[PDB]
Design a protein around this motif. Structure first.
Motif, PDB file in Angstrom:
ATOM      1  N   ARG A 122      47.239  44.546  50.747  1.00  0.00           N
ATOM      2  CA  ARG A 122      47.445  45.107  49.496  1.00  0.00           C
ATOM      3  C   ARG A 122      47.052  44.128  48.420  1.00  0.00           C
ATOM      4  O   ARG A 122      46.379  43.104  48.809  1.00  0.00           O
ATOM      5  N   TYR A 123      47.647  44.189  47.176  1.00  0.00           N
ATOM      6  CA  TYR A 123      47.280  43.396  45.905  1.00  0.00           C
ATOM      7  C   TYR A 123      46.214  42.742  45.791  1.00  0.00           C
ATOM      8  O   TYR A 123      45.784  41.662  46.125  1.00  0.00           O
ATOM      9  N   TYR A 124      45.142  43.829  45.536  1.00  0.00           N
ATOM     10  CA  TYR A 124      43.931  43.660  44.697  1.00  0.00           C
ATOM     11  C   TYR A 124      43.871  43.864  43.556  1.00  0.00           C
ATOM     12  O   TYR A 124      43.803  44.932  43.183  1.00  0.00           O
ATOM     13  N   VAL A 125      43.499  42.917  42.549  1.00  0.00           N
ATOM     14  CA  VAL A 125      43.474  42.962  41.056  1.00  0.00           C
ATOM     15  C   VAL A 125      42.038  42.759  40.423  1.00  0.00           C
ATOM     16  O   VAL A 125      41.631  43.827  39.936  1.00  0.00           O
ATOM     17  N   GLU A 126      41.446  41.548  40.610  1.00  0.00           N
ATOM     18  CA  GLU A 126      40.068  41.281  40.211  1.00  0.00           C
ATOM     19  C   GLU A 126      39.934  41.632  38.792  1.00  0.00           C
ATOM     20  O   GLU A 126      39.365  42.625  38.270  1.00  0.00           O
ATOM     21  N   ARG A 127      40.502  41.228  37.897  1.00  0.00           N
ATOM     22  CA  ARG A 127      40.671  41.221  36.434  1.00  0.00           C
ATOM     23  C   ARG A 127      40.046  39.751  35.849  1.00  0.00           C
ATOM     24  O   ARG A 127      39.913  38.686  36.459  1.00  0.00           O
ATOM     25  N   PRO A 128      39.426  39.814  34.688  1.00  0.00           N
ATOM     26  CA  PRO A 128      39.141  38.624  33.954  1.00  0.00           C
ATOM     27  C   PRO A 128      39.923  37.787  33.522  1.00  0.00           C
ATOM     28  O   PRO A 128      41.212  38.164  33.232  1.00  0.00           O
ATOM     29  N   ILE A 129      39.725  36.572  33.218  1.00  0.00           N
ATOM     30  CA  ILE A 129      40.696  35.418  32.972  1.00  0.00           C
ATOM     31  C   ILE A 129      41.351  35.836  31.551  1.00  0.00           C
ATOM     32  O   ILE A 129      40.697  35.818  30.675  1.00  0.00           O
ATOM     33  N   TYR A 171      39.369  35.657  39.061  1.00  0.00           N
ATOM     34  CA  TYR A 171      40.674  35.946  39.297  1.00  0.00           C
ATOM     35  C   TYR A 171      40.875  37.175  40.256  1.00  0.00           C
ATOM     36  O   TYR A 171      40.964  38.286  39.916  1.00  0.00           O
ATOM     37  N   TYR A 172      40.124  36.604  41.418  1.00  0.00           N
ATOM     38  CA  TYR A 172      40.017  37.661  42.781  1.00  0.00           C
ATOM     39  C   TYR A 172      40.857  36.755  43.751  1.00  0.00           C
ATOM     40  O   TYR A 172      40.565  35.714  44.178  1.00  0.00           O
ATOM     41  N   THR A 225      37.050  40.738  35.787  1.00  0.00           N
ATOM     42  CA  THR A 225      35.927  41.010  36.613  1.00  0.00           C
ATOM     43  C   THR A 225      35.135  39.616  36.918  1.00  0.00           C
ATOM     44  O   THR A 225      34.712  39.556  38.279  1.00  0.00           O
ATOM     45  N   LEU A 282      53.803  47.274  44.010  1.00  0.00           N
ATOM     46  CA  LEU A 282      53.038  47.536  44.910  1.00  0.00           C
ATOM     47  C   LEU A 282      54.065  48.043  46.208  1.00  0.00           C
ATOM     48  O   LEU A 282      53.752  48.751  47.052  1.00  0.00           O
ATOM     49  N   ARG A 338      45.658  39.365  48.375  1.00  0.00           N
ATOM     50  CA  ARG A 338      46.634  38.732  49.494  1.00  0.00           C
ATOM     51  C   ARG A 338      47.557  39.841  49.620  1.00  0.00           C
ATOM     52  O   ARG A 338      47.868  40.763  49.248  1.00  0.00           O
ATOM     53  N   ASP A 377      47.309  33.080  44.834  1.00  0.00           N
ATOM     54  CA  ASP A 377      47.707  32.666  43.663  1.00  0.00           C
ATOM     55  C   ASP A 377      49.098  32.414  43.427  1.00  0.00           C
ATOM     56  O   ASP A 377      49.698  32.491  42.352  1.00  0.00           O
TER      57      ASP A 377
END
Ligand SMILES: O=C(O)c1ccccc1O
Ligand SMILES: O=C(O)c1ccccc1O
Lengths: 677, 677
Positions: free
Chosen positions: B3-10, A4-5, A1, A666, A8, B506
């Motif tokens: 697509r490919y949307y994650v948005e997670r903590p490091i 890491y956004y 959160t 995906l 793409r 990324d």
């Protein structure tokens, strides 16, 4: 959160490909880069004269205030240990004992000129001396008497002269071989010497030296066995002659073991301000000879003695370059073994002190030392382990410690030397075995490697056994080849793991070990942490079919069985996938509805023709069933090895590759959604 | 974007770890899984009786409408090719020609019972027969005459009887060895036979057979050389005796080459409705003998003839199990070579037809065939290549084609056989060489492998040379070991590439080949597509220092130089990084301000003690300079090999690992931002 956004577009091989373009990659002076070489600039010639001869690096940049004292103390201690060790390994080589001093004098100073290392005591190494003795005995057996004109008594001097000549010849050949390999940039081979490989090999050599010198201190004389099972034959020969020993030889041998023990007690007994890190070996040998003389054990019980040591430097003499045709095999053996040991010791000590040593330069220097020693009546030479460790631990920081040790040995060989005349082999035995003490403590590697990794234990034990029961040249070759076979094995039993998906993220972890990585429905992901090549090709395919639970052969068999039981009453214009040739009944066994298989190629380093063929078979089979296959984690090497072979004939196959596991997942889900129209 | 949307903590290794928990992993019946085994259920015993004896799989499930006709035609063609080929390889083994028929009869039917393959013509393979002849000649040389009581003439029958006995002994030993290895699950070794390895090895064998049978058709008689450089000695012996040849032998030999050529023309000349895929070899041999008899070339010019063929099945006889002590070495050689060839042919044909073959079961079946053949006066047997290809291409789909061929050979050996009496070796020569035609066309692998991958060309050429100039046992062993060494090499010259960052994404790609992957500032990323172990440890560290442009030794040297020039007037309580011990001046050379080095471990499959030590040195050095090091792409194997060795003593080292390159990059940037307070 927090970070890491990315957000793409899905990078399938074609998409990522068009979003990139290749750089020129135009190399400079293709084919002939040597035009920029062959320059006469002073810096390049300076580096050349430094690298082929490193004596010019120390004397200019030599600190004096602190290096000198450490060099003095280390040199004194090293020379002290050099003398009896040199004599012992001289008589272990079936040569007169003086050649031990010759070996301790000439190669040491020549290496000091030419060697690239700061903590090594060049000298008569035990195993190299043992090989020299083996060949010398083999070509000049004890029952071959050459009748001269004297016939006074059964003089052994003719035999010993022949043994010296054959030793000189084999050592010249070893020097020539080492020099040739060193100038042929062969020092790179010094990297196929793993830490356990060297540890086990040197430990086996320690066992060999222990048994032979054990034959020596008992005062018993037996045949010098050699070859395969050499240690077994030697020790059973000693045990067969445990009787008729020399009682006083054991008396003095255990007595000098006793003076070593009383030396550990002497560290706590007599030390106030004067004693430096005393080389206890000198006081041990002097006390041994003095106590033996005073107690009158030789003249009353006939202990064996080192023998007359002819004083004087012997002039150089060209050796007979005609025994090569029958000594070349074990000359090669001696060269390889000596180079391997000395380079391992140099590399090991180069990590404790931050600097680096040049392997092939060490080969060149050691070869020149051996050759010129052969010119000066000197048997073969490498880096001993106990002496080198003593020199490092004492505090020496430049090869001038070795030079000082050579100076001390020269003083012994020229001015003095009469005092060492009445010296028993038992003292030398204790010196050698005490030097073997740490090398035997080195068995602690076994439980540690058992805990750490059993492949390193396998290399250690295989090296130990092969270098103990077989020879040491053959043991070294077998140990190295097993080392490379263990690396091979590690790519034939990889970790076949099926990957789940961490929820709400793109991290994929093993499904059946974390209970929070519930796999994505309708998809099975298979990962191999090993390259796919000929030796690991069918294992991979069998593991893929077995572990994921998806067997195309079983599926086709069940399909034809269900169909049978039901009836009770462009240029490659081929779609890679085939549709489902089923009328959607329920007679077939209801399993899972897996529709894609995502093979992981992030860990796959390389591929070849056999691996390309087996992936072609896998894709074709699963396509015939009706299951897509996506290769996730495309790399430059993998796609290169796939394009070079006729895998990417592109009916649609270029669209199967993906750049990440989540990208493949995906893409599969998007394709499935687009299929539901 | 799509697509490919994650948005997670490091996910650093500690962060990812606490967001997971381990499953029980409790295995079933640890140690002793055999309790669930050793069951007497009918299915397991049925599978056992199927796998140790696969004849019970075909006869029950045997389609008749279409398999029968193909089996008939394939069997006829295969038996036709079996007869002259068997006789030729019989006389190539220095035995009377009948034992070729014995070898073509017994092992074929026994393999038909016990073999697991549907396209193989078991029989007297050329190279196996050549080894048999070599040992038979070596132990019974032509100048050893055993004087009997007859002394009538210089009878060769005693020599030939001794040769038959020694052949029987060595073949029994080969059968016993193959059976033992087959029951010892040794058929897994059949996987260290790459496609180029087999192609080159069999091609070299084809060259050997060509030269020997070339000696045969010239009508010249020379010594049968064997050993190393055997082919060279044999062909120079033939060339030395090109003179004093037999002119009519060449006449008929080129004439039957002529009938093969006229046979290709005959396919276009005489075929309307009757001719099946005719086995041209039968008409060739019959025409050869008939034309030779009619033209009167033997009785007028004395051509060599096959010789008398004693009619009748010979009774079984126990062979002398006392020559083993001097035949065991090349009995091992024959067993290994035959098994390797037959398993390669079986695997190659098992891909064309979808099924699979059991390697160790093939070993068991071939060994039993060889053993029982030895009981019945039959030399050693494996899968020939030309005959097997002919049987497959003709259309046979079950081993009953081989059974029919054995029936035809039995008919030849029992009822008829008088017609083949007056047959010249020239016909047999042409038969063998024409069978060698495709095997020689197999050189097309060289340019193809040159284009595709030069390591596969290296294995091909090394196998060719080692199996041509050396022997064939030694050639096979050397070829396999080089194959494994090439796999080793491929991990010592990997692709050291520095990774840039694709903008706004990324995806990390090689920096200096795509001109759109401008690297992230202040960070250098280094990637190796190879495991980090002892043989590739120092190469990796040197490449890391050299390629990224960041050398800690150079940096410390420049730092001390600048400082010198400036002065013209917890239990491991160590921070892994050291701060900058600089007063922030400008005298030092202004380079780059790289502050972290992100090593890529996504491609690193495994590690060992030496690799752990070298990463420890790398981290320590760059920390001493003041540069962080982050290992990106942590896997289970890599972290296991890092934890087992005492790498994760955790001063802070557990915080350095990251799960992705982008994770490491973002962590580095976040840490740098937090440092700017
Ligand atoms: O120098 C020795 O005596 C020695 C011999 C073999 C192995 C290690 C050693 O230190
Ligand atoms: O059958 C043969 O003559 C032969 C011999 C060596 C290699 C391949 C072959 O087909």
């Amino acid at each position: 959160t927090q970070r890491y956004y990315v957000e793409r577009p899905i990078f399938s091989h074609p998409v990522l490909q068009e979003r990139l373009h290749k750089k020129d990659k135009i190399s400079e002076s293709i084919g002939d880069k040597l035009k920029q070489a062959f320059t006469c600039t002073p810096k390049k010639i300076r580096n050349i004269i430094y690298m082929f001869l490193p004596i010019t690096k120390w004397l200019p940049a030599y600190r004096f205030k602190e290096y000198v004292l450490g060099d003095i103390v280390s040199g004194i201690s090293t020379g002290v240990l050099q003398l009896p060790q040199g004599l012992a390994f001289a008589m272990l080589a079936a040569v007169p004992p003086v050649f031990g001093l010759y070996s301790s004098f000439y190669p040491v100073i020549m290496y000091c000129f030419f060697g690239t290392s700061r903590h090594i005591s060049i000298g008569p190494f035990a195993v190299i001396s043992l090989m020299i003795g083996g060949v010398a005995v083999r070509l000049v057996p004890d029952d071959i008497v050459i009748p001269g004109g004297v016939n006074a008594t059964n003089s052994t001097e003719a035999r010993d002269a022949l043994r010296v000549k054959v030793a000189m010849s084999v050592t010249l050949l070893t020097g020539i071989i080492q020099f040739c390999l060193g100038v042929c940039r062969f020092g790179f081979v010094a990297i196929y010497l793993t830490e356990p490989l060297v540890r086990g090999f040197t430990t086996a050599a320690a066992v060999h030296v222990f048994t032979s010198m054990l034959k020596y201190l008992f005062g018993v004389k037996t045949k010098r066995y050699s070859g395969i099972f050499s240690v077994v034959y030697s020790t059973v020969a000693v045990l067969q002659n445990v009787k008729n020993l020399n009682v006083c030889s054991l008396g003095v041998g255990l007595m000098v073991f006793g003076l070593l023990l009383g030396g550990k007690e002497f560290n706590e007994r007599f030390k106030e301000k004067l004693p430096a890190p005393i080389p206890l070996e000198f006081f041990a040998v002097v006390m041994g000879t003095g106590i033996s003389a005073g107690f009158s054990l030789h003249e009353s019980y006939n202990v064996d003695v080192v023998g007359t040591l002819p004083l004087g430097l012997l002039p150089p003499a060209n050796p007979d370059t005609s025994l090569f045709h029958l000594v070349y095999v074990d000359a090669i053996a001696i060269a390889i073994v000596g180079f391997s040991v000395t380079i391992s010791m140099a590399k090991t000590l180069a990590n404790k002190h931050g600097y680096q040593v040049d392997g092939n330069q060490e080969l060149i220097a050691l070869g020149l030392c051996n050759s010129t020693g052969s010119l000066f009546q000197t048997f073969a030479i490498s880096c001993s382990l106990s002496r080198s460790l003593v020199q490092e631990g004492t505090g020496g920081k430049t090869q001038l410690a070795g030079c000082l040790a050579s100076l001390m040995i020269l003083l012994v060989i020229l001015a003095t030397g009469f005092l060492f005349e009445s010296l028993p082999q038992a003292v030398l035995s204790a010196i050698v075995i005490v030097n073997l003490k740490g090398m035997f403590m080195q068995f602690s590697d076994l439980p540690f490697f058992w805990r750490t990794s059993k492949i390193e234990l396998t290399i250690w034990l295989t090296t130990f056994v092969s270098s103990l029961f077989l020879g040491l040249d053959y043991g070294l070759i077998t140990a190295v080849i097993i080392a490379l076979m263990t690396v091979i094995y590690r790519t034939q039993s990889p970790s076949y793991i099926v990957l789940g998906q961490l929820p709400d993220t793109d991290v994929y972890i093993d499904i059946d070990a974390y209970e929070e990585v519930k796999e994505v429905p309708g998809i099975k992901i298979f990962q191999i942490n090993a390259p796919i090549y000929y030796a690991n090709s069918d294992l991979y395919s069998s593991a893929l079919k077995r572990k994921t639970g998806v067997n195309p052969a079983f599926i086709l068999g069940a399909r034809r069985k269900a169909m049978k039981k039901y009836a009770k009453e462009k240029y490659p214009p081929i779609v890679t996938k085939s549709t489902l040739p089923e009328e959607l009944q329920r007679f077939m066994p209801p399993g899972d509805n897996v529709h894609t298989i995502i093979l992981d190629f992030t860990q796959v380093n390389f591929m070849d023709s056999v691996g390309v063929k087996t992936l072609a078979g896998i894709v074709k089979e699963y396509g015939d069933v009706g299951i897509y296959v996506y290769l996730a984690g495309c790399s430059a090497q993998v796609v290169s090895d796939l394009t070079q072979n006729q895998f990417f004939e592109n009916p649609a196959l270029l669209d199967l590759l993906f750049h990440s596991i989540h990208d493949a997942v995906l893409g599969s889900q998007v394709r499935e959604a687009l299929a539901e129209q």
